[PDB]
Write an enzyme that holds these catalytic residues in place. Structure first.
Site, PDB file in Angstrom:
ATOM      1  CB  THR F   1      -0.955   0.028   1.212  1.00  0.00           C
ATOM      2  OG1 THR F   1      -1.852  -1.089   1.141  1.00  0.00           O
ATOM      3  CG2 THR F   1      -1.769   1.327   1.248  1.00  0.00           C
ATOM      4  CD  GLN F   2       4.220   2.410  -3.817  1.00  0.00           C
ATOM      5  OE1 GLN F   2       4.356   3.529  -4.324  1.00  0.00           O
ATOM      6  NE2 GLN F   2       4.842   1.335  -4.287  1.00  0.00           N
ATOM      7  CG  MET F 107      -2.790  -6.319  -1.461  1.00  0.00           C
ATOM      8  SD  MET F 107      -4.111  -5.384  -2.261  1.00  0.00           S
ATOM      9  CE  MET F 107      -4.500  -4.176  -0.995  1.00  0.00           C
TER      10      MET F 107
END
Ligand SMILES: *[C@@](C)(CO)[C@](*)(O)[C@H](Cc1ccccc1)NC(=O)[C@H](Cc1ccc(OC)cc1)NC(=O)[C@H](C)NC(=O)CN1CCOCC1
Ligand SMILES: [Mg+2]
Lengths: 244, 231, 195, 222, 240, 233, 212, 235
Positions: F1-2, F107
């Site tokens: 997740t970024q 992800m």
């Protein structure tokens, strides 16, 4: 590769014997004799120290007799260093059982597990077996006083009186001669010392070349006491039976 | 002698005997031939049976629509190596949408075979392979040896008595290389080539195995009544 | 699940356990036995999360039965209860803990005494003259505080137990479809069929 | 927070005849209120007379089709070039989908072809692998618009024989390929009218024992 | 991990380590199994070079795997404990998943499989043990007697013996056991078992162990006096 | 997740009769701050492919390194690395598409929208899109970000379907692209005046144009706008 | 879903509906909710379609492996416990299943086991499982006797599904009937609610709430 | 000593060649393939008369359409059968169909060379795998520990194999009936067996499309033995 240097410790001979176990037993037969005698009111453990030097500190020494818990002790015959590895495992195993069930470990259960560890070293892993034979002396509320012996094969058996180490053949004949079932502890003490005195490779049996222990119900009412004899106490018991 | 216990040991003259013994398994294997023109590449294989009640051991394996090989030696080892090729051809397609070059196929087999010749415990592969294919640079023929050595050729042969076919192809080189846009003639040249390796036995209908790949021809194998045309 | 009771009297331990298995707005079963025999003189009742209960009970059962065969000997109720507590004490710090509360009723043949242990899913063990898990305790403990005597017979214990079930049937919100009663004494474990 | 899923719109439709089967799908590809492509095919010939479409999230759809096509390839390698039957394909796809039960392929999958008796076959899947053979299935954004129309026109639901007092049902019969294509075209023009994610073009893949044929038709581009 | 292939083929097609494990079994004390019409009896030799033994606590030769199945053996004692433990665990595991105790055939098949696994696994030697597994399937009154050996092969026997001088007692059983009419009662079965051991043993004192298994988890071990009565009875009929 | 930090805006492109055109401005935004002005977001691979990248710049620089390495790896043991076995646009795309989808499935996506423009070995125009979700599609015109909303409508007036491609010249196509870049400068708040443009033609090859500027802008009418309703002054 | 199965004098009746739903969208009316594991074992499906369909098919493979290994058909108890132990391993992961393992063996006789995705496993004579289970219970319980004939038992099972199909919005389509005897299971047809309702209404005189 | 996966100078794996000697010591197993079915027969060979011969399980079911007979170190076959059964059932789960007999054999043969320094040695058992599928019909395969398998019209493995194979060479033709094949297995088994052949020391089985794989009863085989003796005396 490394195959070249593998002794193959866990294989069978053409006759169906385990080489390393047989040679470990041959090693143990040169170790100081240890004797266990089970009486109706207690157990005696007697062991001969390996050729002592006069400058050896005798009182703060432990070579043959070890305490596993408050109810169980062992006499050792073989490599001491090997025995201590196994003793610490046995001590931990007893505490695991006590932690789990809130009851002191039954003697046979402790003996079986220690013997199962020895067995493993003869079947897998490619390591040398432990060069140790034990005499287990202990008490529990199921079978009362018990004597066992285990050896490098991981095989164990129960006994009324037994010897391990040197001169077991001669020692077992003498025990088989004078032992009887209604025997008391104080009689067993005398038998143990007399047997060592005759089978010993030394000139004369003295206090400084012995370790001694009793497991009696000689405490106060329905409880067991372990007595690892002090040097002076062995000196006295040796005089009391008229060996010195 | 004392230096053939495993692949990890060099002999005093710098030889790897286990690799050489693996090479020997190929010599015992049934003959198989490979040859190509500029448009097509052809495999011809003599199949072998256990007896008259048995089937004939299949020698040719498909790797992709544009590539495949023939084997000589340990068949299970060919199955391992062909399966590896199938995966590598497939990786090239899924990831890069690219048909694996026949030359890279050779490089990959070389490197897979080599690792088995330098480590303790393992063994060399006991099979030789003739890989044919058609890619962006035209038709190709490779020869794999379990030493790791892969070689690109116009024609060749491996297996027992392969020297007869290999000599024939060496003479016929100038003829068969220019059989362009004619599958049946290139096969005929291969069937005549493998015939130079026959002794006491001749090519029958359930004995001969032929494969072909080319410009407008996917890698397809011919057995049974489909090879009766060429006898 | 829901209602499990236990009463230790002079010479026996009596376990009562509700028969209902409810899921949503449906009573799926009205004859469920929420207990397992761990050994000839040791019985364990259980209540808690669906699935977990039976899975845990049968797992303990298998271990105690294994011990019995290995040693040719029956573990004391105290020993069994300590084993069970430790398994729950491990469980509570697992990735997914067993959400099971148990009562262990046993007759110690060496001591010739009945013993009742109450253990919750956290591994909280207590020996008691009478025990209960869940909301049952909020009625039964005060009731038993009044009517229980330590020297009662098995018959007196069953009448004392009837008094608990009646109170629960009167004041509990849910229909638990009665109880299966079992007695643990010197002669082992037996079920009362008419309760 | 990163959202791994998206909705690429479009809709698909499969109908089975007596000796044929069709798998249709519009060629529009969208994200939110934008058109990505007016011609991006999502109905594919997978070999062995099996046509497939995985409509919904295109990245998952393409991934699945790619994996199934590859599954057909390895089925040949491992089982002596044996033809993969439509029922076997269906079961294989269930395992592909259910393999990602806890991180699903966001797609409604439909495959079409011929069964082992030569009769038309349509199988349809939910996102996690549940499947069922049917005569009829619409999938995707406009599935709720098209499906009831298919129930009425393919399976003759709610249609009774005139003058029989609603006692005798309209008898079931197979439709000709000409009749089926009429229903497909009318289904898609109707869906295009009332659904914003459907339009641009219609591509139909027809499967008979002779092979896989294609037909293309323009749809409204608004 | 220790990886060495200890059990391997020799030029003549033998696996010597498995065959040398059979020699260990041949060294072991004699064990015999005889099944009657409604029972199985397991007899076991105990060598008498060991006096001053404590028979209360010394491991018994016959072990209960479950309440309905028993296992005796010949060979290395330490090795047998490992097989017995695994068997006992599998017995409880079977009750847990199948909700039914093991059949004697299944329990035998499991033990035989373990023995086989140690003949083609790296780093381990074969078990120097052959077993006799006897009992009754759940809700069944047909007697079952099976034998296993280091190689991993197992089979059913009407009567069988293993261990030292087993070929002598097998000779005895082969002529004294009638397939058409097995020992009709418990007494007949125990006697035939004791007779067979008396061909090999020495004295019928504290050298013979007998364990009788009957249907529905009915297993009991005979005491010295009970066994001694069979010994006394057989010898008096012999002097004829 | 970024979350994306330094970002690049629209990448626009279209097909014409002999090849493809692609363009992207030279800005590296840091939120509302127009931080970096010398950022090249068109990266050529060989002499037949240009990869245009929008979104996170740290992830763009990672992708640059991957493409750079792909060229190196393709050259290994490849005598035809500059001929028949040179990297095709379709190979470069499929590789990136694989990576993008794998990263979203773990992800941990590369926060980008990518357009691979090039010409195949057989002369065919290649133009295909891929993004952080692994979503792929192709069209006669392709654009990312604001380009999708503003450029595509303009570019589709020139090439509305497949049959319009042969009818479109490089002069007409480039004019439409340059016009679109101006429109984006009027309306996109994270765009810059400076941009790069690349033409991959099947005859003339790769033409890479740097330091272009938006010009011929209409601002004069602004003088006439007063207040927001009632103001006459 | 509405599924039921009850034990009686003449064996086991098993009845299920055939609807599949995705929210309020009726996804299918012709779904199969009984899986024939072997000639003597049946499995009913309620809950997640894929979950039920996938794992009960898998259960069938495990039952086949049992009879290959043990040379004997698997017990209903053992078959149900394979499934229950499986779903217990997944407990918390979000599987959705309400299943009934119905069958006959020699040692057990006719047997029914309820197994759900929270790990509950119950032996019993009567169960109803699904969103419309309560509607089925209402009719089934109020007409059930052990001494029902095979003809009457088949009808009651059919009528109980019809009751639920009518009232429960997420049940319907058609009724699939099964009868399990000592000789194995016997299929007793697919019965469309479209025709069955009016047929039952007319002949039985019930469903007076509906406009005739 | 020496490596387990070592090649001999002739280009053969020592251990694989030595395992082949172990198989020659094994009891005889014979298979014959016809257009009406495939027959599998084995010599039980009880080591002692007290051993209950019906517990000797040398013919084994893999699936309903595939059967298996073994010869050599039969304990080694247990994990091979276990794998075969799992492979067969697993394929049915993944593809909703019966698995091809050849594909099954190939799966079993993949285990064969998974030994070295994976298991510690090759298998010491040869298998005869007989079955039927829709594509290639009735088939008989001989699976060896080398990882190689041949399809056979007829095949004998074990101690009496080379003598029995020479007999099968003469007797087999492409128009044999199932009944003719049954008698032929019994006939050839009786020739190569040490002890006299009867229903207790020999076992028959077959696989047919209609009824699948079936091991014959001792009563059924006894009648075929009696039918065989009468036919040989009749000329
Ligand atoms: C009735 C109709 C009420 O649902 C039944 O329970 C029926 C049971 C059934 C069993 C086998 C074959 C057909 C029908 N269940 C459904 O139809 C089921 C309802 C349901 C949906 C989602 C669930 O997850 C919480 C649980 C139950 N419908 C489906 O499974 C539909 C066809 N598929 C999906 O909703 C796809 N989802 C499933 C969960 O993962 C995401 C995708
Ligand atoms: Mg529009």
């Amino acid at each position: 590769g490394s195959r070249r240097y593998d002794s193959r410790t866990t294989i069978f001979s053409p006759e169906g014997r385990l080489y390393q176990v047989e040679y470990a037993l041959e090693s143990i037969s040169h170790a100081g004799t240890a004797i266990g005698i089970m009486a109706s009111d207690g157990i005696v453990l007697a062991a001969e120290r390996k050729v002592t030097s006069t400058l050896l500190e005798q009182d703060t020494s432990t070579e043959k007799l070890y305490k596993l818990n408050d109810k169980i002790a062992v006499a050792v015959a073989g490599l001491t260093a090997d025995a201590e590895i196994l003793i610490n495992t046995a001590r931990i195993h007893a505490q695991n059982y006590l932690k789990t069930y809130n009851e002191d470990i039954p003697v046979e259960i402790l003996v079986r597990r220690l013997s199962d560890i020895k067995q493993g070293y003869t079947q897998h892993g490619g390591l040398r077996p432990f060069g140790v034979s034990f005499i287990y002396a202990g008490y529990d509320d199921r079978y009362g006083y018990q004597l066992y012996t285990s050896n490098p094969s991981g095989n164990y058996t129960g006994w009324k009186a037994i010897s391990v180490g040197a001169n077991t053949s001669a020692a077992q004949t003498l025990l088989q001669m004078d032992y009887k079932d209604d025997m008391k502890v104080d009689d067993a003490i005398e038998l143990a010392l007399k047997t060592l005195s005759k089978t010993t490779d030394s000139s004369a049996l003295t206090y400084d070349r012995l370790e001694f222990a009793t497991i009696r119900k000689g405490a106060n009412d329905g409880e067991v006491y372990q007595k690892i004899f002090k040097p002076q106490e062995i000196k006295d018991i040796l005089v009391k039976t008229g060996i010195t | 002698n004392n230096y053939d216990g495993d692949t990890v040991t060099f002999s005093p003259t710098g030889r790897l005997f286990q690799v050489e013994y693996a090479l020997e398994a190929i010599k015992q294997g049934s003959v198989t031939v490979g040859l190509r023109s500029n448009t097509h590449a052809v495999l011809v294989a003599l199949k072998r049976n256990a007896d008259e009640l048995s089937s004939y051991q299949k020698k040719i394996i498909k790797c992709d629509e544009h590539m495949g090989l023939s084997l000589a030696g340990l068949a299970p080892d060919a199955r391992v190596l062909s399966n590896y090729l199938r995966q590598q051809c497939n990786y090239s397609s899924l990831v890069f949408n690219r048909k694996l070059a026949v030359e890279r196929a050779g490089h990959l087999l070389c490197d897979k075979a080599q690792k088995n010749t330098q480590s303790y415990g393992g063994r060399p592969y006991g099979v030789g392979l003739l890989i044919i294919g058609y890619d962006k640079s035209g038709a190709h023929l490779l020869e794999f040896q379990p030493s790791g050595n892969v070689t690109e050729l116009y024609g060749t042969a491996i297996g027992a008595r392969s020297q007869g076919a290999k000599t024939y192809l060496e003479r016929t080189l100038d003829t068969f290389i220019k059989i362009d846009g004619n599958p049946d003639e290139l096969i005929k040249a291969g069937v005549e080539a493998i015939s130079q390796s026959l002794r006491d036995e001749s090519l029958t209908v359930d004995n001969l195995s032929i494969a072909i790949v080319g410009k407008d021809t996917p890698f397809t194998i011919y057995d049974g009544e489909a090879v009766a045309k060429y006898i | 699940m829901d209602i499990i009771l236990g009463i230790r009297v002079q010479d026996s331990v009596i376990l009562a356990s509700s028969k209902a298995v409810t899921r949503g707005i449906s009573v799926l079963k009205d004859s469920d036995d929420k207990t397992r025999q761990l050994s000839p003189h040791t019985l364990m009742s259980f209540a808690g999360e669906a699935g977990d209960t039976v899975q845990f009970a049968e797992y303990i059962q298998a271990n105690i039965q294994l011990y019995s065969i290995r040693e040719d000997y029956e573990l004391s109720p105290q020993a069994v209860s300590s084993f069970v507590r430790q398994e729950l004490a491990k469980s509570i710090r697992s990735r997914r803990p067993y959400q099971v509360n148990v009562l262990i009723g046993g007759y110690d043949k060496k001591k010739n005494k009945p013993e009742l242990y109450q253990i919750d899913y956290l591994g909280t063990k207590v020996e008691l003259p009478y025990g209960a898990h869940g909301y049952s305790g909020f009625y039964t403990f005060s009731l038993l505080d009044h009517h229980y005597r330590p020297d009662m017979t098995t018959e007196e214990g069953l009448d004392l137990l009837k008094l608990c079930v009646q109170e629960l049937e009167k004041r509990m919100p849910m229909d638990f479809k009665g109880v299966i009663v079992k007695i643990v004494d010197k002669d082992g474990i037996r079920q009362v069929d008419d309760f | 927070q990163f959202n791994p899923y998206g909705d690429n719109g479009g809709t698909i439709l499969g109908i089975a005849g007596e000796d044929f089967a069709v798998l249709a799908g519009d060629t529009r590809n969208i994200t939110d209120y934008s058109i990505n492509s007016r011609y991006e095919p999502k109905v594919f010939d997978c070999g062995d007379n099996i046509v497939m479409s995985a409509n919904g999230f295109a990245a998952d759809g393409d991934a699945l089709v790619k994996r199934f096509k590859n599954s057909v390839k390895w089925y040949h390698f491992d089982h002596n070039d044996k033809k993969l039957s439509i029922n076997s394909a269906a079961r294989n796809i269930q395992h592909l989908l259910y393999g990602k039960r806890f991180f699903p392929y966001y797609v409604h999958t439909i495959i079409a072809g011929l069964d082992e008796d030569g009769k038309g076959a349509v199988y349809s899947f939910d996102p996690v692998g549940s499947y069922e053979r049917e005569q009829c299935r619409a999938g995707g954004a406009a599935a709720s618009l098209i499906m009831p129309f298919l129930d009425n026109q393919v399976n003759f639901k709610n249609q009774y024989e005139p003058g029989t007092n609603g006692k005798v049902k309209k008898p079931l019969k197979y439709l000709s390929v000409e009749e089926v294509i009429k229903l497909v075209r009318d289904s898609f023009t109707s869906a295009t009218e009332r659904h914003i994610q459907v339009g641009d073009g219609l591509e139909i893949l027809i499967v008979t024992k002779d092979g896989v044929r294609k037909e293309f038709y323009e749809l409204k581009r608004d | 991990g220790y990886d060495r292939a200890l059990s391997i083929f020799s030029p003549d097609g033998h696996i010597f380590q498995v065959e040398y494990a059979l020699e260990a079994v041949k060294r072991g004390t004699c064990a015999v199994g005889v099944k009657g019409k409604n029972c199985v009896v397991l007899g076991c030799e105990r060598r008498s070079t060991l006096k001053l033994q404590d028979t209360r606590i010394t491991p018994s030769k016959v072990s209960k795997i479950d309440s309905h199945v028993v296992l005796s053996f010949s060979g290395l004692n330490a090795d047998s404990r490992i097989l017995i433990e695994k068997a006992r665990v599998e017995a409880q595991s079977h009750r847990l998943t199948l909700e039914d105790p093991v059949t004697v055939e299944y329990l035998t098949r499991y033990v035989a499989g373990v023995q086989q696994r140690y003949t083609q696994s790296g780093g381990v030697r074969p078990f120097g043990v052959s077993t006799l597994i006897a009992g009754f399937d759940p809700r069944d009154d047909e007697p079952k007697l099976y034998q296993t050996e280091p190689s991993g092969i197992y089979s059913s026997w009407s009567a069988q013996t293993i261990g030292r001088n087993s070929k002598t007692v097998r000779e005895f059983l082969e002529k004294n056991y009638d397939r058409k009419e097995p020992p009709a009662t418990v007494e007949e079965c125990v006697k035939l078992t004791v007779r067979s051991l008396l061909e090999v043993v020495q004295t019928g004192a504290k050298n013979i162990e007998i364990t009788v298994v009957k249907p529905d988890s009915d297993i009991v071990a005979l005491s010295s006096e009970e066994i001694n009565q069979y010994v006394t009875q057989i010898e008096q009929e012999k002097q004829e | 997740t970024q979350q994306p930090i330094v970002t690049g805006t629209s990448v626009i492109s279209m097909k014409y009769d002999n090849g493809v055109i692609i363009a992207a401005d030279n800005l590296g935004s840091y939120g509302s701050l127009l931080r970096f002005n010398g950022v090249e977001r068109l990266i050529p691979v060989g002499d037949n492919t240009v990869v245009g990248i929008s979104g996170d710049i740290s992830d763009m620089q990672h992708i640059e390194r991957l493409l750079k390495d792909l060229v190196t790896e393709n050259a290994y043991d490849n005598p035809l690395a500059d001929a028949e076995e040179a990297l095709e646009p379709s190979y470069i795309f499929e590789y990136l598409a694989t990576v993008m989808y794998q990263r979203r499935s773990k992800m941990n996506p590369l926060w980008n929208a990518i357009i691979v423009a090039g010409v195949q070995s057989n002369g065919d125009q290649f133009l295909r899109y891929v993004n952080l979700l692994g979503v792929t599609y192709s069209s006669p015109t392709l654009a990312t970000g604001f380009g999708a909303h503003m450029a595509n409508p303009l570019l589709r007036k020139v090439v509305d379907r497949e049959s319009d491609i042969p009818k479109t010249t490089v002069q007409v196509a480039e004019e439409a692209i340059v016009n679109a870049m101006r429109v984006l400068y009027y309306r996109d708040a994270r765009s810059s005046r400076n941009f790069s443009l690349a033409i991959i033609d099947k005859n003339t090859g790769l033409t890479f144009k740097k330091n272009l500027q938006v010009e011929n802008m209409k601002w004069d009418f602004a003088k006439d706008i007063k207040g927001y309703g009632t103001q006459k002054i | 879903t509405t599924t039921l199965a009850f034990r009686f004098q003449g064996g086991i009746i098993v009845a299920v509906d055939s609807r599949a739903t995705a929210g309020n969208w009726v996804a299918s009316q012709t779904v199969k909710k009984v899986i024939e594991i072997n000639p003597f074992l049946l499995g009913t499906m309620a809950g997640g379609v894929a979950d039920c369909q996938f794992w009960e098919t898998w259960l069938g493979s495990q039952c086949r492996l049992h009879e290959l290994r043990e040379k004997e058909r698997i017990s209903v108890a053992a078959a149900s416990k394979i499934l229950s132990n499986l779903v217990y391993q997944y407990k918390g992961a979000g599987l959705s299943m309400g299943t009934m393992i119905c069958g006959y063996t020699r040692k057990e006789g006719p047997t029914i086991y309820y197994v759900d995705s929270d790990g509950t496993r119950l032996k019993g004579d009567i169960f109803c499982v699904g969103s419309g289970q309560t509607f089925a219970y209402g009719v089934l319980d109020s007409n059930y006797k052990w001494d029902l004939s095979v003809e009457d038992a088949l009808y009651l099972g059919k009528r109980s599904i019809l009751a639920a199909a009518h009232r429960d919005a997420y049940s319907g389509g058609s009724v699939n009937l099964y009868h399990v005897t000592e000789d194995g299971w016997i299929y007793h047809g697919n019965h469309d609610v479209g025709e069955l309702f009016w047929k039952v209404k007319e002949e039985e005189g019930s469903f007076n709430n509906v406009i005739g | 000593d020496r490596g387990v996966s070592t090649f001999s100078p002739e280009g053969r794996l020592f251990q694989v060649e030595y395992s082949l000697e172990a198989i020659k010591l094994g009891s005889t197993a014979i298979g014959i393939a016809t257009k009406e079915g495939v027959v599998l027969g084995v010599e039980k060979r009880a080591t002692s008369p007290l051993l209950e011969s019906d517990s000797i399980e040398k013919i084994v079911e893999i699936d309903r359409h595939i059967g298996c007979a073994m010869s050599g170190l039969t304990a080694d076959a247990r994990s091979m059968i276990e794998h075969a059964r799992t492979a067969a059932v697993t394929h049915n789960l993944y593809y909703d169909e019966d698995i091809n007999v050849e594909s099954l054999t190939q799966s079993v043969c993949d285990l064969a060379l998974r030994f070295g320094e994976l298991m510690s040695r090759p298998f010491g058992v040869a298998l005869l795998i007989a079955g039927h599928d829709a594509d290639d019909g009735y088939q008989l395969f001989h699976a060896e520990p080398s990882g190689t398998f041949y399809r056979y019209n007829a095949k004998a493995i074990g101690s009496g194999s080379e003598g029995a194979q020479a007999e099968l060479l003469n007797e087999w033709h492409s128009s044999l009936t199932l009944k003719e094949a049954e008698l032929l297995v019994l006939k050839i088994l009786k020739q190569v067996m040490e002890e006299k052949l009867d229903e207790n020391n020999a076992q028959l089985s077959c696989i047919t499309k209609q009824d699948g794989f079936k091991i014959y009863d001792n009563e059924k085989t006894a009648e075929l033995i009696k039918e065989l003796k009468e036919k040989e005396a009749a000329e």
